[PDB]
Amino acid sequence: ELLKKLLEELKG
Amino acid sequence: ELLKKLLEELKG
Amino acid sequence: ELLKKLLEELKG
Amino acid sequence: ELLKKLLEELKG
Numbered sequence: 014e015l016l017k018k019l020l021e022e023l024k025g
Numbered sequence: 026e027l028l029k030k031l032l033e034e035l036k037g
Numbered sequence: 038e039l040l041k042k043l044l045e046e047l048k049g
Numbered sequence: 050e051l052l053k054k055l056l057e058e059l060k061g
């Protein structure tokens with residue numbers, strides 16, 4: 014989940 | 026958009 | 038060239 | 050680095 018949160022923020 | 030789609034694929 | 042650099046960065 | 054390269058290609 015931590016990586017999902019990072020990736021969603023990079024996506025915007 | 027391409028980057029949004031690829032980041033979404035990496036997120037899974 | 039923009040597309041070539043994009044593809045290079047995607048492939049690593 | 051991918052973002053840097055795209056910005057380089059916009060700058061020319």
Ligand SMILES: [Cl-]
């Ligand atoms: Cl300059």
